[PDB]
Amino acid sequence: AAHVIAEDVKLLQFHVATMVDNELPGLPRAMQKSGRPLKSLKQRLKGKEG
Amino acid sequence: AFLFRGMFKNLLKEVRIYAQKFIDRGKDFNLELAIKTRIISDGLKYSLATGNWGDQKKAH
RNA sequence: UCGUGCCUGGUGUCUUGG
């Protein structure tokens, strides 16, 4: 149904989008249950240490 | 004192849900099991250990 | 009188060095 599929593709939109980039303006952040934000592919190469 | 406020509030949230799950059955509820010891004992011990002045889930 | 060998830690934070 359109509503449940929309929830599936929006949360899919969230996980795929957070994979590359875990720093969105006005968007929740991907975090491990171990209490830390995930290092996305962009975070592997963004900063001074990437 | 800043800590102990929040840590005591947490345990009032525990005893809350524990009273609820138990009255709704129409049974009676017991506070000894409701009292989550690991709030104080671990929160203190945590903040004094890491240095993070907060809760473990909002530690950033 | 004998014949086998590189395993091997990641994450954060405070202190301190020029």
Contacts of B60 in chain A (CB under 8 A): 36-37
d(CA A15, CA A21) in angstroms, rounded, equals: 10
Is B43 buried (19+), middle (13-18) or exposed (0-12) by CB count in 10 A?
buried
> Which A residues 17-46 have CB within 7 Å of strand C?
34, 36
A10 CB-to-strand C distance under 7 Å: no
d(CA A16, CA B16) in angstroms, rounded, equals: 38
Note the residue count of chain B: 60
Which experimental method was this entry solved with?
A: cryo-EM
Cα-Cα-Cα-Cα dihedral of A41, A46, A47, A48, to 10°? Answer: 100
Contacts of B56 in chain A (CB under 8 A): 35
d(CA A35, CA A39) in angstroms, rounded, equals: 13
Q: For B57, which residue in chain A has the nearest alpha carbon?
A: A35
